[PDB]
Symmetry: C2
């Protein structure tokens, strides 16, 4: 066995039986390496078979490791540059051996974000809560992409397999991944807990509109623009520690408090309370932005390249929280819509790379995508269904030629 | 015999020769004919202050009305001027029908002021500054007082017995303003009477919510309702916030260090110049702050509603097993027996468990019949009997409001006066 230690950049030849446990190989090297530093988080990785040799109690015979096979001994945790929904990069350390879903779950608790199942990873300290507009229009124009439907549909091929690890999906250390809200069904947006969660969701929406990733009318746009201007004003209040109006604070309390406190003591306790008032007004203002965003006709759709039965042209399959949509690749016009509530079950033919959905009233849908898109779309369908049952991390992996049944089929 | 009839607006007395079989309309014609004036008589009606009733039924005879000889009648216009103090403590002059039932009068007043659900509001007699014309911004604009001195000068006794005295002034919704000793150009209080607000919708109730917020704000400022110091400073913060939000709705200029062009997609920088982008954004922002304003006032009301002493109307009453004058308290869902000194709740009954209730007008006693034959009986002052009765019937009628026209006839059924008996329409089980 040739074993490469990644961080020390050294290859080690090891004498192997075939009956010795994986933990044995680890034991054989630590004695052979004889180094005074911590090996606690290192694990064996087999890039030839793109699988972790995590089950340590098992033997080499069960794993089938041939002679002169190139194994790696690598730390599970690596550094990863994540771009938040606010388009700001943050450096964090994540487990490259954990399932992506669990990885995202841990990240959200770290970032203080509830319901991580709404978020995922996409291929290309007070910063988590503060939201500020750019300094100049040039910054926006410099970030501008074509944002055409085919450009977006291509990007959606990058959604990671939530049931696999980071290492199995061609992600090296210090590469850039996008942290994004993947499913557009937001459950319980509670201002009492989700100050950071709501802020990022608002930011994701704000950029999507600014960078024309989603379309809206001029009236809608000016409305969204006004909200940002409003939200910035509210933000200033949360930091303001002074009277900034022409109103006497003593006019806002009952006269019995004029006897108990001096004028400065009233101005103080009101401003303290006002900061808490504006803090919730801030969150609720961002809530309205999101609500308007949610009500847009083109909201909540994820596009994938697909050809439908009897089709002569390139088209788009679109997945929303409540429906699947056949779309024109140029205009985005809805050709036909099937609703998820009317879905009994669905089929995935991995050979032909075809998805088939069965609905009530014997309605049947069939289309064909890229093979990568098949796993992505499969996870999207099962995910949106799994999210509809919120009132269980294991069930998410259950729902993500295979056949799966909609648990919420009525009739 | 002879009828002496005074025409109020013309300041003239007229002696009329009457049979006693002559119709009410006959008196009116004889009056118009003897006066010999080229005047509009459309809104005049006969009024009898001795018997304190309107003679509106024109087809009746003087005998059916029971009009004695030499009785002093008045011929007066039905619509008169009335000074109303809004919940924002500002007075407004409006013209209302003094012959209509108060319930309809309030309804007419509220649609004039653009306030939905008038059945929640009514008119209250004063237990200084009573003159101002009808303007649109007196109804919608909310501004804090100019000095702490204003609060101390408007301060009234807020003890429970003071409240019970004030609540003696609630008008009979089934009678008219004239029948209840209300002269023209007098001051009445327009207030939210019942504390069960159905569908407070910011899309329509910009004025309704504002006035309701004002009533709550003043009740707290004038210490008519109690709250903790944390709560008080919170309400104080809210006002400071609401004033700031209000200022924004009029501001038509940039007052931040942020460039407005950073708030739109780059496609609009080519279509518009910087000035019109700053303009159209400010135009939309005013409506944004306008909705923030309403939502802030809504939160104020919600906090107000959540206060432990909220939504209770107090009346002086003597109970059966009582050694003392005590207080009966009426909330939207319950009746409460209270100690007049401490304000402690002795016992509470639910409206849901109420089958029916009786009113002995002679003894001035109200008796409520509940499930499990538990029975409550008390006695109030003369005036309070009809008043307390109207509060009970009203709150029940308000419980029948569903998301589905207001059965005005039903309201008078549950709050009718002159031993009568009334049945809970919302009795569960």
């Amino acid at each position: 066995l040739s074993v490469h230690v990644t961080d020390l950049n050294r290859d080690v030849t090891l004498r192997v039986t075939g009956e010795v446990h994986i933990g044995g190989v680890m034991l054989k090297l630590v004695e052979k390496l004889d180094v005074k530093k911590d090996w606690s988080d290192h694990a064996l990785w087999w890039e030839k078979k793109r699988t972790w040799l995590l089950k340590t109690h098992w033997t080499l015979d069960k794993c089938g490791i041939q002679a002169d096979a190139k194994l790696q001994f690598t730390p599970q945790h690596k550094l990863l540059r994540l771009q938040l929904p606010n388009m700001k990069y943050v450096k964090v350390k994540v487990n490259f051996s954990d399932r992506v879903f669990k990885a995202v779950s841990d990240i959200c608790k770290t970032f203080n974000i509830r319901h991580p199942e709404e978020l995922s990873l996409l291929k290309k300290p007070g910063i988590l809560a503060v939201s500020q507009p750019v300094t100049s229009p040039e910054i926006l124009a410099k970030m501008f992409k074509p944002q055409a439907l085919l450009d977006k549909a291509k990007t959606n091929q990058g959604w990671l397999d939530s049931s696999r690890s980071l290492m199995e999906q061609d992600v090296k250390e210090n590469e850039a991944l996008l942290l994004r809200f993947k499913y557009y069904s937001f459950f319980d947006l509670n201002p009492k807990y989700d100050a950071i969660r709501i802020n990022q969701l608002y930011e994701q929406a704000k950029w999507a509109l600014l960078l024309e990733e989603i379309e809206c009318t001029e009236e809608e746009m000016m409305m969204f623009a006004a909200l940002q201007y409003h939200i910035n004003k509210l933000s200033i209040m949360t930091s303001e520690n002074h009277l900034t109006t022409d109103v006497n604070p003593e006019c806002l309390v009952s006269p019995r408090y004029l006897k108990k406190y001096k004028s400065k003591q009233i101005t103080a306790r009101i401003l303290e309370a006002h900061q808490n008032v504006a803090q919730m007004s801030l969150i609720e203002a961002k809530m309205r932005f999101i609500q308007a965003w949610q009500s847009l006709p083109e909201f909540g759709i994820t596009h994938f390249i697909a050809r439908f039965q009897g089709g002569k042209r390139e088209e788009l399959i679109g997945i929303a929280y409540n429906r699947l949509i056949r779309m024109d690749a140029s205009t985005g016009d809805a050709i036909k819509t099937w609703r998820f509530s009317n879905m009994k079950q669905w089929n995935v033919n991995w050979e032909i790379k075809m998805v088939t959905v069965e609905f009530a009233d014997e309605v049947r849908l069939s289309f064909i995508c890229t093979e990568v898109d098949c796993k992505v779309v499969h996870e999207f369908i099962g995910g949106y269904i799994f999210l509809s049952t919120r009132a269980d991390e294991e069930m998410f992996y259950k729902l993500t030629t295979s056949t799966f049944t909609n648990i919420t089929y009525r009739g």
